[PDB]
């Protein structure tokens, strides 16, 4: 299974436009993941990481994006926040694994890496596994926006000002969410 193409990718996506790789018709060796000393987050829900290499699944999904350090907690079932409500929402019955690691050496630029964005304004909360890439001006007040940024009329996305000297809570973290479908199994452990 192409696990390296997700974890060892040169470019990562923003939270609002989180990528997804469907993995099927292969054998997945999870030992390469839970034996690595490179991850700061490794929480599996409804599954054991050790027993993962001896189970079969019909399909497994790999979602990848970039958030800051203090927002990794929101990538978990039953969490609330700007990321969990407006960017990437996990279901309360989530059966999978969440992996993350610090990426300050790659995603932080001197003048601030303004390429990584997150959605700050939205009229409703996201459904589990829903993605919104809209760029419509958010009407925070009583006057229409007409597609122009202005008074109480905001562009819905806000840029992470990722600087390498920021605090660890404000530093970029590359996150890979693994979801195992429990629905004919096409992926299995060794």
């Amino acid at each position, epitope marked *: 299974c192409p696990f390296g193409e997700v974890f060892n990718a040169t470019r990562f996506a923003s939270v609002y436009a989180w990528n997804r790789k469907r993995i099927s018709n292969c054998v997945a060796d999870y030992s390469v993941l839970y034996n690595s000393a490179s991850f700061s987050t490794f929480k599996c829900y409804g599954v054991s990481p050790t027993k993962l290499n001896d189970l079969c699944f019909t399909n497994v999904y790999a979602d990848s994006f970039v958030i800051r350090g203090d927002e990794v907690r929101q990538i978990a079932p039953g969490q609330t926040g700007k990321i969990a409500d407006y960017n990437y929402k996990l279901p309360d019955d989530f059966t999978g694994c969440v992996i993350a690691w610090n990426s300050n050496n790659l995603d932080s630029k001197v003048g601030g890496n303004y390429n990584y964005l997150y959605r*700050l*304004f939205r009229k409703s909360n996201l459904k589990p596994f829903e993605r919104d890439i809209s760029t419509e001006i958010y009407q*925070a*007040g*009583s*006057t229409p926006c007409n597609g122009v*940024e*202005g*008074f*109480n009329c*905001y562009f819905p996305l*806000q840029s992470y*000002g990722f600087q390498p000297t920021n605090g660890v809570g404000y530093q970029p973290y590359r996150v890979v969410v693994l979801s195992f479908e429990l629905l004919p199994a096409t992926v299995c452990g060794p």
Partner: antibody
Amino acid sequence: VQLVQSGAEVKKPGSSVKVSCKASGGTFSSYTISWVRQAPGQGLEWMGRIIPILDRVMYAQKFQGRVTITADKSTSTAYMELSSLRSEDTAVYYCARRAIDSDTYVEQSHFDYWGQGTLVTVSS
Amino acid sequence: EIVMTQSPATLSLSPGERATLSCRASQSVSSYLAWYQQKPGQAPSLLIYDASNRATGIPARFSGSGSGTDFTLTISSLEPEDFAVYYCQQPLTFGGGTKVEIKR
């Protein structure tokens, strides 16, 4: 809750001016800073507004390309810079603050506090 | 930009009379309107905000009304200190101003 501005300046035609507006601590977390000028014997003219908590700034149409408004959260001070000064830019420049909700980012339209004003005279 | 037209330009009245000041907009500003008073040598002082809400410490003789594009500032009975310039303000622009002077 005070707004103290820099001293009066005399600038030559074609030069640039930077007027400062120091605010009380914590103002940049629940307030936005705007700049309003008033030529002698004339009315008020809104130039632009900066939102420190979002790093967002907007300018009036007449002042786009000549005004740059910045906010230094380290010193709790806001700045305004007018590029190509000439005679009709001679005015008393005020810094004024408006309330904004730190969670919804909804800004009020009315100003609740004004500065003492800074007289900028453009002349050779 | 929405142009705010204030009418009239000058009002000559006497203390004890009612003053009605008009502010009209070329496009709807909803209720995002404020009224300010400025005396000579002073900074503007807020009187009414959000079209109809009186500011703290403002006497009850000042009243604001209107919505969208038509607004009105009303001084029920003029006091001698009320003779100054009055501005209406939208989220982006100020009005031209109305001068209230004493008739004589």
